[PDB]
Amino acid sequence: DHRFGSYAAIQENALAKWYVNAKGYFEDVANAMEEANEEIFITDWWLSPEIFLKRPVVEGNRWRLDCILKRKAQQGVRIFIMLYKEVELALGINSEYTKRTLMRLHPNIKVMRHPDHVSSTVYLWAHHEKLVIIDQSVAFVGGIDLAYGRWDDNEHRLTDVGSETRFWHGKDYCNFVFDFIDRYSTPRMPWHDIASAVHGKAARDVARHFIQRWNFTKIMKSKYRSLSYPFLLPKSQRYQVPGSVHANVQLLRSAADWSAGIKYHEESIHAAYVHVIENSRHYIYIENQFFISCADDKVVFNKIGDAIAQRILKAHRENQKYRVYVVIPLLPGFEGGGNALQAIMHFNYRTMCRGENSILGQLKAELGNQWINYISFCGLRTHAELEGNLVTELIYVHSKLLIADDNTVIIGSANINDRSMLGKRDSEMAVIVQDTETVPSVMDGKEYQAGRFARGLRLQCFRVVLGYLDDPSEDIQDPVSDKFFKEVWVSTAARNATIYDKVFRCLPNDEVHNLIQLRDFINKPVLAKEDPIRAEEELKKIRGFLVQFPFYFLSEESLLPSVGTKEAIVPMEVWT
Ligand SMILES: C[C@@H](CN1CCC2(CC1)OC(=O)NC[C@H]2c1cccc(F)c1)NC(=O)c1ccc(F)cc1
């Protein structure tokens, strides 16, 4: 009975702050935790206790996650951590270890894991929300877990062979695309993510979600054994993070009975995505880990992909100038010859370009090849010089971000898929921030009064991917202009994609349509190794990380014959 059907009201004039990449996010969460007085609420899909939140490594282990919690728990602070119980076959995650590891620090640290391992019921879905709440007054929401490989800055380095500084220590140096990886022979996979912070009553809204799940999980755990944990209570009607701005903030979530014990499932994140897309007047910026939409009422059901295509058709009808920006990883983040990778690539391409129900399918059916003037799909990629050999790796965009009209922003942990959006599936949490303070800006060449929160986030987002960071940043002020869209965004994305394909002969390529074509393409000479001087000079023309998304990678490959068996028992709705 709130806006979007959310459990949390619209906290008008609240303190909020956006984060691009984890470096600033981990730093503010560390400074906020150190100044805690009563409580610290943590919930993570994956948690790694021995990571440093302040880098370069400053004062020993002072800012290591387990030591930060240990230090505050010894001052009388009650810390509550809620972890996701991984599948038994998930070898990489060991929640039982971190559960004992965290609780062996101090008795003021109590951890609970859901789903229940002892329950006779079978759980398909996970707890993917990432929120840290301090004293129910400061709360952090986004798609960044307190886990290995999340910390990164805006350069997205591929190398870390210093002793000059070593940023990713030990297992924090990882590569989750394509045996402990060799730091001196193989580059790491950079982490591009988005998070945010809120204060005041909006942070109490984030806390109530934590309290509901904590008390709910305790009862469900009690069906099998008694717990020596306490019940938590919401605080009733002091600290501020530097750099926040005043704006309208509302909390959103994806919760059901199995996850939060709610009577009727909630998909406020999903409804807000559709509403912000439908009521956008100028542009939409999308930055998501997965692009699985365009509902067919059989396997896919969320309405985001249909909303994007139908919104462009209205712009084509009313002669409006509209720009959409979709940024997704070049490949899904899984260890082709895989089961989750082939399924997720398929349903991503199904949403993007393959099919009559796809976005471009709905577009081409009425405007033909002139969809290029409205929507653009891109990925991230970078290069580096390692051990004397030129190497490249894609940048995994794990952010779950939506921006519209330089006024509305949605930051959270929910991907664009049925798993995150339906609400009854994976448990997610997001925040929508509508701007009230205006700043002079440009849009469609005219004078535009844009908000400080949203335009500031778009500007920072544009600078990172386009290579205008610590630079004049003169062309990127107007995001809708015909000069910026065609000559800057699509031009930079197209140029970089061809340079990497010519220099590195990397994958994914829109020139490889079959798995048999894949084996011949990579056993071909590479330009980066046979002519390094020419490659290094050619690589200097790259600006930023933006590359165009290949539409025809493994186009002639079908999903069912590769993944299907004679008698299958795994529903396909798990990968959508
Ligand atoms: C790089 C990241 C990619 N994962 C992608 C998949 C998931 C989780 C992150 O993605 C999502 O968003 N939620 C839950 C997951 C999911 C699963 C199936 C279908 C989905 F749609 C989503 N891997 C890890 O962190 C990691 C790697 C190695 C490890 F040893 C331990 C952890």
Curated annotation (Swiss-Prot):
Localisation per UniProt entry: Cytoplasm, Perinuclear region; Endoplasmic reticulum membrane; Golgi apparatus membrane; Late endosome membrane
GO molecular-function terms, A-Z: phosphatidylinositol binding; phospholipase D activity
Top-level taxon: Eukaryota
Keywords: Cytoplasm, Disease variant, Endoplasmic reticulum, Endosome, Golgi apparatus, Hydrolase, Lipid degradation, Lipid metabolism, Lipoprotein, Membrane, Palmitate, Phosphoprotein, Repeat
Main location (coarse class): cytoplasm
KW Membrane (keyword) present: yes
Coiled coil: none
Region of interest (Catalytic), residue spans: 127-430
GO terms (BP aspect): cellular response to nutrient; chemotaxis; phosphatidic acid biosynthetic process; phospholipid catabolic process; positive regulation of translation; Ras protein signal transduction; regulation of microvillus assembly; regulation of synaptic vesicle cycle
Record-level GO cellular component terms: apical plasma membrane; cholinergic synapse; cytoplasmic vesicle; endocytic vesicle; endoplasmic reticulum membrane; endosome; Golgi apparatus; Golgi membrane
Activity control, per UniProt: Stimulated by phosphatidylinositol 4,5-bisphosphate and phosphatidylinositol 3,4,5-trisphosphate, activated by the phosphokinase C-alpha, by the ADP-ribosylation factor-1 (ARF-1), and to a lesser extent by GTP-binding proteins: RHO A, RAC-1 and CDC42. Inhibited by oleate.
Mode of membrane association: Lipid-anchor
Tissues in which the UniProt entry reports expression: Expressed abundantly in the pancreas and heart and at high levels in brain, placenta, spleen, uterus and small intestine.
Keyword Magnesium attributed: no
EC number annotated for this UniProt entry: 3.1.4.4
Reactions mediated catalytically: a 1,2-diacyl-sn-glycero-3-phosphocholine + H2O = a 1,2-diacyl-sn-glycero-3-phosphate + choline + H(+); ethanol + a 1,2-diacyl-sn-glycero-3-phosphocholine = 1,2-diacyl-sn-glycero-3-phosphoethanol + choline; 1,2-dihexadecanoyl-sn-glycero-3-phosphocholine + H2O = 1,2-dihexadecanoyl-sn-glycero-3-phosphate + choline + H(+)
Domain PLD phosphodiesterase: 123-150, 393-420
Function text: Function as phospholipase selective for phosphatidylcholine. Implicated as a critical step in numerous cellular pathways, including signal transduction, membrane trafficking, and the regulation of mitosis. May be involved in the regulation of perinuclear intravesicular membrane traffic.
Quaternary organization: Interacts with PIP5K1B.
UniProt disease link: Cardiac valvular dysplasia 1: An autosomal recessive form of congenital heart defects, characterized by valvular malformations involving the pulmonic, tricuspid and mitral valves.
Similarity comment text for this entry: Belongs to the phospholipase D family.
The protein's name in its UniProt record: Phospholipase D1
Whole-protein coverage range: 337 to 1074 of 1074
